[PDB]
Amino acid sequence: KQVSWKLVTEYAMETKCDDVLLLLGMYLEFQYSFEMCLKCIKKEQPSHYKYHEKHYANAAIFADSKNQKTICQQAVDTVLAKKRVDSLQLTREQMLTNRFNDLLDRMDIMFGSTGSADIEEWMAGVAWLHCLLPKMDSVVYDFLKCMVYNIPKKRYWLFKGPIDSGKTTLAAALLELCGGKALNVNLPLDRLNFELGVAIDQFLVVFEDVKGTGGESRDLPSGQGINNLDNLRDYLDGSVKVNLEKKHLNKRTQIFPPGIVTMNEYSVPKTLQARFVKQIDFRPKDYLKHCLERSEFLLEKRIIQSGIALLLMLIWYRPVAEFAQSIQSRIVEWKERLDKEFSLSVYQKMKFNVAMGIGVLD
Amino acid sequence: KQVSWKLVTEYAMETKCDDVLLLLGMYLEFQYSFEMCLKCIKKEQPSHYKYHEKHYANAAIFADSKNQKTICQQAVDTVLAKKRVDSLQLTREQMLTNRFNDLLDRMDIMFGSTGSADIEEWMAGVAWLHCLLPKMDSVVYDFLKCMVYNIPKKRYWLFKGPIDSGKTTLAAALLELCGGKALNVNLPLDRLNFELGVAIDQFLVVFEDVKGTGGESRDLPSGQGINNLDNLRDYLDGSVKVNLEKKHLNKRTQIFPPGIVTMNEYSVPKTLQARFVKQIDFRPKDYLKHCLERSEFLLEKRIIQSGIALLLMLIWYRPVAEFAQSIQSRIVEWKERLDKEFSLSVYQKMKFNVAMGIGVLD
Amino acid sequence: TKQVSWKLVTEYAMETKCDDVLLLLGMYLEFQYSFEMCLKCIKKEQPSHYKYHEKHYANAAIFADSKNQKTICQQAVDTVLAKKRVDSLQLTREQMLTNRFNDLLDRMDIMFGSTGSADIEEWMAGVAWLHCLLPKMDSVVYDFLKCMVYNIPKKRYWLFKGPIDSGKTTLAAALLELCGGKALNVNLPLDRLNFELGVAIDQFLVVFEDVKGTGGESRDLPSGQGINNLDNLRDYLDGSVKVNLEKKHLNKRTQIFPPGIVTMNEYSVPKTLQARFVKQIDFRPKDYLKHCLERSEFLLEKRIIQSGIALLLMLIWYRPVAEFAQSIQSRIVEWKERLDKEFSLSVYQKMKFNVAMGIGVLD
Amino acid sequence: KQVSWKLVTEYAMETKCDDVLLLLGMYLEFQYSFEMCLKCIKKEQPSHYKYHEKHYANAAIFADSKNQKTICQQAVDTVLAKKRVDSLQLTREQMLTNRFNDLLDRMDIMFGSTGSADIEEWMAGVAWLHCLLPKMDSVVYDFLKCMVYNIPKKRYWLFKGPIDSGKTTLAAALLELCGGKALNVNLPLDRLNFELGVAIDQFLVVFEDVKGTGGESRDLPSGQGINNLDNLRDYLDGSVKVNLEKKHLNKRTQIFPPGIVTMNEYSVPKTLQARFVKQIDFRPKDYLKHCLERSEFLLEKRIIQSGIALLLMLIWYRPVAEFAQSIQSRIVEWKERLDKEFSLSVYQKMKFNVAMGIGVLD
Amino acid sequence: SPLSSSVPSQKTYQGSYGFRLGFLHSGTAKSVTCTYSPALNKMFCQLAKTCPVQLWVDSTPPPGTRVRAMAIYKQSQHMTEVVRRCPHHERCSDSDGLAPPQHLIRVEGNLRVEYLDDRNTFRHSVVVPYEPPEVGSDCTTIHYNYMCNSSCMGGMNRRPILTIITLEDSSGNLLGRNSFEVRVCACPGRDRRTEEENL
Ligand SMILES: [Zn+2]
Ligand SMILES: [Zn+2]
Ligand SMILES: [Zn+2]
Ligand SMILES: [Zn+2]
Ligand SMILES: [Zn+2]
């Protein structure tokens, strides 16, 4: 007869879906029967086969409801509601922890029986990324601490280097690791306040490829990005809550999330520079490039750019005592599993290949 | 069957929750059993365990309603309505006292059988702070008499000092003591009228790091910050009520709140320097710096820039009389808690360490 | 089933002329608690509250249980607004000023009454200060009042010009509230001008505050787009034609822009703009006024010398009961007697005496 | 029990009221008893006492209903609906007639048993105005014939001259006479599209005091007015329909209304000049002024600038044939009543005193 | 809160009877309630707690002799200000019935106690009829109680208080006089130890 708003709201939770449309088109997928749901036999997408059967009895009605969009909106709101609470009450560590588990869960599936990801190929990516920076794993750990601590006036890292030098690759992966958003300050300033709003309730934010003024000798186009960042020094400092808007509306006065700031070799003011607690200079390295040429699968499957790879690095390097007490259990469970399939010999060989630039799995 | 909107509002009213998404998520947690509440028997968030029991039966329904979103609105409106009605009828001093009855109300937790803060740590923060500016307790006291009086064209203080000199910290603190908002008058002007509606019903306002001009000689990027304030003379004066407006909602015609301004030693127009009663010049003091290096916890925990810190400093030095009658009671109730928890000699030692450049807790 | 009475709320919004929806929602919610127990009544601190609680106490309870308090408060405000658009389109500018003066005297009765804090002596001490600002002050206030009431095309603005801290503002503010208007800021980008202007809709007068000009770079005065913007609002300052004031993205007003004051520093007032200004007062640094205030701290601290009452008083003191509308003449008299019964002309002179010597008014 | 939406509507139509907030107020007055109302017996408001008794029941009920604003809307839209149907069906001439009628009606009352208008004072205006320009009566007529024919490429008149030349006064009078709107093209070009929308469904438009370039040689500030006009060529032309908007949406595509343009001896482009079918250069005339410095009432009552005055002028001079048949009878009625009121000698005298600059009523 | 023109002296005067003061060495533990530091002439004690002060005389003075107890701020800059209870404490239901709510110093267990509100000096004080050392003891012990922490006026010992014990006859003339500094806190022990520790 009637429909259960609560069930949809709940399904939206177990999926942490904050997109009404997706939520909609997705729940409607439970409309049909499960008894022969081909999307279930093939086990593609857990978001469907893990809940369909359970919500079948409430999706055959939802398909007839006259307020589909209205209902979904409430679920999504609930999802956002949660995020809000878990950003004013949980500890940054607890946040980074909850994040990891979410990643590990994905890994279990992508590396399990139903998955399709080749553990070897990914691990191989771990090696490529480890040849990107001296003591990469430690940097990854260092970054994680930086973000979790969120020490005022010391929250941002600067990635500076020529075109195609890994600045992004690493930045991107880091982001997926902690979970956050990539903002653009190069865009007009009339949409700037709308862009800066994306960074709400976000763990960390990333200003990707910011443009600067000083630097035409290096044949670099001028931009307002850098000059913009300097104006948002209030936001970067992280000392006093800033006001962020959204959808021509007033959302919240929170502390701006910490993050990375990648940019070409442009000039950087003293006031801005001071906001950066750490600066990493990337430089194009032949072998790293020739390695990918013979290791296509590393870019095709977007491995060297995912946080899951970086996680499969902290687990293959960092000691258990470093992870949050809560995840230690699972972490160790992975160090073993990972160990049984990889001898420091095989791995060492992969890093070596990268050095020679002959493809990891070669 | 039907939800008690009145009840939800009663919650938001005791939580001072003026955030539809916050309130939404928070109340929804009450939808669960209070018999086995892990968040209560573990007492982590008062806003939860202190009201779950009472609001349990209600939330139990609120979770099956189809207007959670809406119902929460009204609740916030009420909270907002109150905040307004009060900024018109209660006197300035009756507002600080109302604020303090919230900080001390939070301190009753931080330093309790449920809190998670080391009273010893904070007193140290006070010590550090009390080394930032001569007679700091007096300065903080004067600032209050300057924010409560609200004398036209005499309602703003100016912190003008070099990068990382403590100017922001102190400001950020006072701002939390009196409550308010921090505005960025550095961004463009085409969309700063909303970035001003945030001062609606706020005790004071803070303009964090304002970029001026003519600072080129000091390697300080030019910004339209200082010049933007000048175009708001009637705001900083407080003689006539200006018009603040939020995104297509609440276009209040009130009198701009008083506050502070922090900038990097730029040039101030004689037409603005007159709207600044007192100007404190901050200087980077090495000993304070090193002290922090050995007292990391003062930053990681954000204490030297917390209102609670200064308030404590006040409960420490300032006489009972200075505080309002309706609070003198709860003040002594603390002047004793501290007198007991610490000792004049012990504290002496603290400022001594800070003065020496070593960790406070030695 | 016991429903709510929108009508009763509307009535409250009116008897208090509440135009703020939220502010209304807050005031009516206070009528939710017990009357016999209201501490905010037996103490008498807010007229707007104790004068209607008992009455609205019945409806309040029902209100506090409605699922759309906002709507009700909205329709109650949309009314108070209508009763504004009408009067500002049917009453005589003389009647308005009078009504404004009534609400001004109402806040004056309680103000200096037993159930309120206000030292009648302090204010008169202010009136004295003010009467020392400009020669024949009490007369200036009238010349302005009339000028505002008449509303003569191309003859509706006064240009208060002077340096930093000369009084311009203190006065402009006083006259402002005295008549009931709005302070506008035309210094910020015009890309938001049309909205800032909308604040003038249904107003009696308008006061453009500091309005930065250009050219005064030799005087070390930051140049702005203020004055230049006014010159673009010529027809706005004129008064002949009706302007189109936009507000909240929906144009709901096509009226003649109201008159008012304009303050500024020693900037350059363009030929075309200087014309829209009828009279021009030149304020200057008054050392003795300064010294007096430093010793009469209460004046500034309680915002008297810049209140719509400090001016109305000056009238009740000097001006003849003749110049006032016969629709409130009695009241004006009741006050004149009241003031003399309380003060001595020789005393008031002593006040100005000190204000001239740069000494604390009282004593 | 349920208020009659058709009664509030009817009233609105019988008052050509399109302001929702006004309608509500107007009607809310009829809620009270007419038996003993003041404003209703003092007969000082035509739009009030004429409908109070008819609209009293639907007012005491309306004052109760909860959908007030919603109703008034329905009503106002009906009005706008009518005007919209008139603009597209009625002939431009019929439009002037309906205007004159509503115009005369006002006269009938303001110049009757009830009303503070003084027929003698107004006549003075008719006179004063007749001294403003050579053959003033054959001008107002020439103008009306231009605003009616609305010939393509020959729709605008250009009043050009110094300050206090009467340009506006006449411009305003002509405006009121026909009924249009005053657009300000001096404002920024960004919002230039909103003012133009006010011209939707209007008989004529008036661009008061437009600013141009090249005026420093005469102490005139620069402006974008003139340029902006030269950008709305197809608007002034009246050849092709223009697309105007207002409610944040393309509300209507119509032939922009014809009109007048008043400016101060600025530089006009030949492209904009060939757009003005007629140009009138005004000059400051001492006697006209002194005549006013003695006949203040003319201004303190906005007569010489009123549109009623110009209608009195035509009625006075113009023959009973240049008008519209249907209005002829009423024209005579006003020629006779206007005759028994004054003698050619008196009227003549008036103009004399004007030429002498001493007081039209000396 | 008006100032006083007078300034009661604090000069140590044993008099023609050799008047002194004896204090109960209550050690420097933690649960201390009232102690004395000879090195500091300071008496650390708790709020409203018994404070035994011993009166030592070589020759028992005449009958009708009284002992006055007055308090003044040790620092000259505020020596003109009147020593009284904080705005809060003077509003507490701690009225024994005899002692006025604004008096700092009080007497415990002496029905013949008299509190004086000197209308000329505005000063506050408490007096009691001197009694000869009861058989078994060589001195007369008096129980005092302070009703305000020294933190209510400065915390960091901004306003140090000094108690003045006067020995006067019936008329009210000086016979003997001793004085000691007073500090009302919550840990007389810890506070005495630390301070003495500062040498
Ligand atoms: Zn399925
Ligand atoms: Zn619980
Ligand atoms: Zn009450
Ligand atoms: Zn009537
Ligand atoms: Zn005390």
Side-chain angles (χ1 to χ4, degrees), chain D residues 43 67 70 154 196 216 225 311:
Chain D
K43 282 182 183 176
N67 270 32
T70 309
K154 291 168 171 286
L196 297 182
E216 63 294 307
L311 175 53

Side-chain angles (χ1 to χ4, degrees), chain D residues 37 40 48 52:
Chain D
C37 152
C40 320
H48 177 32
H52 191 152

Side-chain angles (χ1 to χ4, degrees), chain A residues 51-300:
Chain A
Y51 314 77
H52 181 114
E53 170 187 54
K54 177 181 185 302
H55 287 277
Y56 173 82
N58 189 75
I61 312 301
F62 177 83
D64 281 69
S65 181
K66 302 173 189 60
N67 274 37
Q68 284 175 174
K69 191 165 193 170
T70 307
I71 295 163
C72 291
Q73 240 310 310
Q74 181 142 87
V76 175
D77 271 301
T78 311
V79 172
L80 300 178
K82 190 55 187 166
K83 284 176 154 59
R84 189 58 111 286
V85 203
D86 286 345
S87 78
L88 303 159
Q89 320 196 308
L90 291 184
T91 43
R92 297 197 64 78
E93 189 166 63
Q94 182 86 66
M95 304 199 263
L96 197 268
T97 301
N98 274 318
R99 175 50 178 161
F100 279 1
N101 271 300
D102 271 310
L103 294 166
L104 284 175
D105 274 292
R106 192 183 303 165
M107 298 179 64
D108 293 318
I109 298 171
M110 63 190 295
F111 290 122
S113 175
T114 75
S116 56
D118 184 347
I119 189 60
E120 192 183 82
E121 290 184 60
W122 280 69
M123 191 55 59
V126 194
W128 188 95
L129 278 182
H130 210 292
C131 301
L132 180 61
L133 243 48
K135 304 186 177 180
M136 185 55 98
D137 65 315
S138 289
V139 177
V140 170
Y141 182 73
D142 272 299
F143 175 63
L144 296 179
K145 292 312 95 178
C146 171
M147 309 315 265
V148 182
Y149 279 141
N150 204 193
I151 295 171
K153 180 55 178 175
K154 298 176 152 80
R155 292 126 43 60
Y156 277 72
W157 274 29
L158 179 68
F159 283 11
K160 204 163 77 175
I163 304 75
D164 188 300
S165 42
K167 311 198 312 306
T168 307
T169 311
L170 178 58
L174 276 167
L175 193 148
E176 177 170 316
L177 173 65
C178 316
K181 285 285 167 305
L183 307 188
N184 179 309
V185 293
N186 298 298
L187 283 177
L189 308 83
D190 288 7
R191 287 294 184 295
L192 194 63
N193 283 286
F194 269 70
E195 190 73 24
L196 289 184
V198 182
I200 279 179
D201 292 327
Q202 295 312 71
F203 185 69
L204 83 82
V205 94
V206 168
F207 293 110
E208 233 295 293
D209 210 330
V210 186
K211 239 131 73 74
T213 58
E216 3 283 302
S217 75
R218 214 106 58 183
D219 318 297
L220 286 178
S222 291
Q224 287 299 308
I226 290 302
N227 240 285
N228 269 314
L229 289 174
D230 184 283
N231 284 314
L232 302 179
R233 49 185 56 182
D234 172 10
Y235 291 51
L236 295 189
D237 272 304
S239 252
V240 195
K241 313 184 170 204
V242 297
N243 330 95
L244 311 166
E245 71 183 4
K246 173 178 292 186
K247 178 190 182 58
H248 56 290
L249 207 163
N250 282 59
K251 289 298 290 293
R252 184 190 148 196
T253 297
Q254 64 165 76
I255 322 78
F256 199 62
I260 328 280
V261 173
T262 76
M263 55 140 117
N264 276 11
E265 269 162 297
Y266 293 98
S267 180
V268 190
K270 60 133 70 176
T271 30
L272 180 66
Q273 183 75 62
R275 297 302 190 295
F276 295 123
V277 69
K278 198 183 200 301
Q279 167 161 176
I280 301 182
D281 291 306
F282 286 73
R283 314 74 47 191
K285 309 217 71 184
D286 288 311
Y287 60 106
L288 284 170
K289 181 188 84 189
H290 296 308
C291 175
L292 289 177
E293 278 183 46
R294 325 203 68 170
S295 285
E296 304 79 18
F297 70 99
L298 284 183
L299 287 179
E300 275 171 31

Side-chain angles (χ1 to χ4, degrees), chain B residues 23 99 160 186 199 212 218 243 289 302:
Chain B
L23 172 84
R99 169 66 173 171
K160 187 173 179 287
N186 292 304
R218 315 196 59 167
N243 304 300
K289 184 179 179 303
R302 284 189 167 80

Side-chain angles (χ1 to χ4, degrees), chain C residues 75 151 191 231 234 244, chain D residues 66 182 184 191 209 211 302:
Chain C
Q75 172 160 294
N151 212 197
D191 304 297
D231 190 36
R234 287 171 185 188
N244 308 291
Chain D
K66 329 191 197 76
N184 185 296
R191 40 195 40 60
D209 218 315
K211 288 225 283 280
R302 291 189 159 66

Side-chain angles (χ1 to χ4, degrees), chain D residues 124-321:
Chain D
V126 187
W128 192 92
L129 278 178
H130 208 289
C131 294
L132 176 73
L133 229 43
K135 296 175 154 293
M136 190 51 112
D137 63 333
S138 294
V139 175
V140 177
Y141 180 74
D142 273 333
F143 179 76
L144 302 178
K145 285 313 97 179
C146 185
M147 297 307 99
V148 167
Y149 275 50
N150 184 258
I151 312 305
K153 293 247 171 182
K154 291 168 171 286
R155 270 139 40 70
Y156 278 75
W157 275 34
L158 163 68
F159 295 168
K160 198 171 180 192
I163 305 166
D164 270 312
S165 318
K167 296 197 311 304
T168 305
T169 314
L170 170 58
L174 281 187
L175 174 60
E176 175 148 37
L177 184 69
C178 304
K181 286 295 177 305
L183 319 194
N184 185 296
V185 279
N186 289 331
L187 298 171
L189 306 77
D190 304 303
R191 40 195 40 60
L192 178 72
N193 289 75
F194 289 92
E195 197 77 325
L196 297 182
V198 172
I200 286 183
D201 288 332
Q202 295 289 129
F203 183 69
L204 59 68
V205 179
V206 173
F207 296 116
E208 235 285 293
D209 218 315
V210 173
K211 288 225 283 280
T213 326
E216 63 294 307
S217 305
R218 305 144 203 170
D219 296 350
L220 302 179
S222 289
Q224 306 313 303
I226 298 304
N227 238 293
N228 277 319
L229 282 175
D230 195 77
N231 277 304
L232 302 167
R233 297 171 177 192
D234 47 357
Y235 280 53
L236 306 180
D237 259 4
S239 208
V240 297
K241 269 179 298 113
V242 153
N243 327 125
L244 292 320
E245 51 161 35
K246 185 160 59 183
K247 186 200 182 62
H248 232 298
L249 65 96
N250 304 77
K251 185 168 156 48
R252 181 168 160 58
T253 289
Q254 75 193 61
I255 289 285
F256 198 62
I260 308 178
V261 179
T262 63
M263 51 167 100
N264 291 155
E265 294 173 292
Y266 284 97
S267 179
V268 181
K270 71 164 168 186
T271 45
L272 179 75
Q273 189 64 62
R275 211 73 57 174
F276 299 123
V277 81
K278 177 171 186 66
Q279 180 176 153
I280 295 173
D281 302 311
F282 291 74
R283 289 171 176 180
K285 293 172 182 169
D286 43 290
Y287 59 90
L288 277 165
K289 169 186 174 178
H290 299 330
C291 171
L292 239 55
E293 298 186 312
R294 305 196 58 188
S295 300
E296 321 179 309
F297 74 100
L298 283 183
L299 283 166
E300 314 197 323
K301 304 204 182 180
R302 291 189 159 66
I303 308 165
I304 63 165
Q305 91 159 218
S306 159
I308 287 307
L310 283 181
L311 175 53
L312 285 176
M313 183 165 105
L314 295 155
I315 288 301
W316 183 246
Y317 290 83
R318 300 292 114 185
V320 184

